[PDB]
Amino acid sequence: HKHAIPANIADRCLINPEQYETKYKQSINDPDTFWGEQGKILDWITPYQKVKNTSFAPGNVSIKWYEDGTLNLAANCLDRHLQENGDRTAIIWEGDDTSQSKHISYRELHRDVCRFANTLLDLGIKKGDVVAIYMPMVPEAAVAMLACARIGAVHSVIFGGFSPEAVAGCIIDSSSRLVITADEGVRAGRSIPLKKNVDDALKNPNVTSVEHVIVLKRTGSDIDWQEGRDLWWRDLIEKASPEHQPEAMNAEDPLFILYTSGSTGKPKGVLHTTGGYLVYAATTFKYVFDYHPGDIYWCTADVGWVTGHSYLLYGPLACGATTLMFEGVPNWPTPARMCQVVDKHQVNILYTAPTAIRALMAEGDKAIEGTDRSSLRILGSVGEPINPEAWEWYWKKIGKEKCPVVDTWWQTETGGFMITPLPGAIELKAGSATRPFFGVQPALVDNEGHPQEGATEGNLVITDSWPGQARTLFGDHERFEQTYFSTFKNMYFSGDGARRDEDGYYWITGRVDDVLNVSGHRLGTAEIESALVAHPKIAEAAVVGIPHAIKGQAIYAYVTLNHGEEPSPELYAEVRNWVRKEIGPLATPDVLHWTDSLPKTRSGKIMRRILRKIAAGDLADPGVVEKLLEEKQA
Ligand SMILES: CC(C)(COP(=O)(O)OP(=O)(O)OC[C@H]1O[C@@H](n2cnc3c(N)ncnc32)[C@H](O)[C@@H]1OP(=O)(O)O)[C@@H](O)C(=O)NCCC(=O)NCCS
Numbered sequence: 001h002k003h004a005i006p007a008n009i010a011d012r013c014l015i016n017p018e019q020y021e022t023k024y025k026q027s028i029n030d031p032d033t034f035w036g037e038q039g040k041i042l043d044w045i046t047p048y049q050k051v052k053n054t055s056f057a058p059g060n061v062s063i064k065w066y067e068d069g070t071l072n073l074a075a076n077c078l079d080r081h082l083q084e085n086g087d088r089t090a091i092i093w094e095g096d097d098t099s100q101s102k103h104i105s106y107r108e109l110h111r112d113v114c115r116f117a118n119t120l121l122d123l124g125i126k127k128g129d130v131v132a133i134y135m136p137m138v139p140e141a142a143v144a145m146l147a148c149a150r151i152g153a154v155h156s157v158i159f160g161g162f163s164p165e166a167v168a169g170c171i172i173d174s175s176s177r178l179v180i181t182a183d184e185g186v187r188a189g190r191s192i193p194l195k196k197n198v199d200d201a202l203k204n205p206n207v208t209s210v211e212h213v214i215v216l217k218r219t220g221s222d223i224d225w226q227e228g229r230d231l232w233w234r235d236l237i238e239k240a241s242p243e244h245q246p247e248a249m250n251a252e253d254p255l256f257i258l259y260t261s262g263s264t265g266k267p268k269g270v271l272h273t274t275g276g277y278l279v280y281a282a283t284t285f286k287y288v289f290d291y292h293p294g295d296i297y298w299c300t301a302d303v304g305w306v307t308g309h310s311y312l313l314y315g316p317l318a319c320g321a322t323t324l325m326f327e328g329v330p331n332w333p334t335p336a337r338m339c340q341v342v343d344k345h346q347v348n349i350l351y352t353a354p355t356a357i358r359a360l361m362a363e364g365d366k367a368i369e370g371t372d373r374s375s376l377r378i379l380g381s382v383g384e385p386i387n388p389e390a391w392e393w394y395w396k397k398i399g400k401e402k403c404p405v406v407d408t409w410w411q412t413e414t415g416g417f418m419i420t421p422l423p424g425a426i427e428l429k430a431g432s433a434t435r436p437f438f439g440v441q442p443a444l445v446d447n448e449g450h451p452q453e454g455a456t457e458g459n460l461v462i463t464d465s466w467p468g469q470a471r472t473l474f475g476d477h478e479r480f481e482q483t484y485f486s487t488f489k490n491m492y493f494s495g496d497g498a499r500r501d502e503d504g505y506y507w508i509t510g511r512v513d514d515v516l517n518v519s520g521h522r523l524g525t526a527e528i529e530s531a532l533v534a535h536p537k538i539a540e541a542a543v544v545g546i547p548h549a550i551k552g553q554a555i556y557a558y559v560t561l562n563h564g565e566e567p568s569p570e571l572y573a574e575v576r577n578w579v580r581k582e583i584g585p586l587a588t589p590d591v592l593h594w595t596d597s598l599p600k601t602r603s604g605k606i607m608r609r610i611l612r613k614i615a616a617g618d619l620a621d622p623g624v625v626e627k628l629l630e631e632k633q634a
């Protein structure tokens, strides 16, 4: 079944089928002309000359776009919208508790960003410094990010769900001088500790770069205070001048970094610059959500994830849109919360994730009970594969069969959408991301690197660069080159697998490396195993993912205890909490399989293929298989 483009969307769409084909063709054959013209969607302090100047050469990757043009992301997302839209709402904030909400106008957001920018500067923050941001879903998070960008300070946002240990690891690597957090976050009626986590993270003897901690009082809970180091958000911003002139930043000046899990090692600091990134974010956001001035847009992705950076704040603010930042979860107090918010603020564009959709779908009509949903015109999905059933449920129950669904595939390393549908230009196939965006050249290659044509499948790679592509891994360009450009020479390897149908539509099946997808979260198997083995009683571990009807994949961990140790309710609880404390609750195993027989190869390496099978329900010592099979049966 191929969903047709609705007449209402066809009558106002920015891009129709004919225009998609044409623009796409030019973006591929002549990217300098295409991107040269399209980069004007942003205001440039000094125009650029060169457009595309990239190379995927082995051990010699170089990615630059609009390299000689200078601009300011904050000015593009705020200042240039004041004169004609200063009164227009920039951010709609919906508290965890519906009785709490805010409507921050562009003029207001701009004023606060200016005051906070001066705050950072008066504190000693300069262009190039890294500022760690450990914040919940509140306006202050966007103010902190925009202020950092405004002065050229590279921000390092850290998802509130990361543990103290995980936070320390990010600060150590980035050598952040400042940490901006809140006393506590509020999520689903509960108060999540944030400030205390920073104190704990700062006790790590390896953390030496942090000199100050700005704290936002969100709950007013009793917290420990370190005079001199810690400072209240309210006290600082109120002393700062609301007068701040944006300075020119180079197109390739670092904008921010996001620590992302990889097949091996601990999370790396994916780094994005300013020009190409902002151009790509505003262009993708605009065309894929078919944004028209006046549209109420709502991305549910957390500010701590790339989706939050690109489609909650930057992409939509750059286009002068009204973006909604929700503080809690889609089904709290009830599964109909998400739709209640939609009606409350007349949302026209909803962009959420398959996990949330599945969790709501599990509640049947209770998710749309008592709600209208008529204000919606466009629906979007991101983060993980979505099966036809969930896609149709979303399309029918949430979109009332009137809104096209945009399943956007991309990664932290791509900055923005790569393979996605365009509402008024591409007919939809439930579960399919469809065709590649402008400037994106996808391809399927076998494990040997040979391209595969026609209806086929294989490793998903991008044969060329695009404006929003990550420029490197903080402090480790070599790892950047090896991780993404060594598997298949001269090509970007996403680590994903996908098939292409008879029509040329792409279907992403999932990671082909050892990266897991837990409730729409990217986590490496290796990092979970290291965390486990770090426990004084754990000798060795092997982690695999298993299918889960709601969260996509559950974490199944095979654990080998040192000699003299024995399984017990207490140790079962200690190990799970060890991972929660080492990485965070998101990486907490749902299953612990105690075994003294891990499958391995004569060389010593562990074979996770056979482990993945058993865990789901399906050679130095083939005996381990039979033993493993039974331990699992128990
Ligand atoms: C059920 C639903 C509301 C939340 O599912 P979830 O993402 O698995 O999160 P859960 O509520 O199950 O949380 C699991 C654990 O993570 C923690 N956690 C999740 N988000 C957190 C946050 N922002 N800050 C702190 N802790 C967080 C919880 O406290 C919990 O730990 P605990 O049991 O030890 O207290 C889901 O339907 C949803 O909306 N998920 C969206 C998440 C996502 O995929 N985002 C990417 C969008 S692109």
Ligand SMILES: CCCOP(=O)(O)OC[C@H]1O[C@@H](n2cnc3c(N)ncnc32)[C@H](O)[C@@H]1O
Pocket (backbone or CB within 6 Å): 260, 306, 307, 381, 382, 383, 384, 385, 386, 407, 408, 409, 410, 411, 412, 413, 433, 494, 495, 496, 508, 510, 511, 521, 522
């Ligand atoms: C883009 C939001 C999250 O970014 P992250 O860097 O955390 O994770 C990117 C990975 O999420 C999956 N993924 C993302 N979007 C989709 C999608 N739309 N369909 C299927 N899988 C998807 C793909 O496997 C990809 O390697």
Ligand SMILES: [Mg+2]
Pocket (backbone or CB within 6 Å): 533, 534, 535, 536, 537, 538, 539
């Ligand atoms: Mg150990």
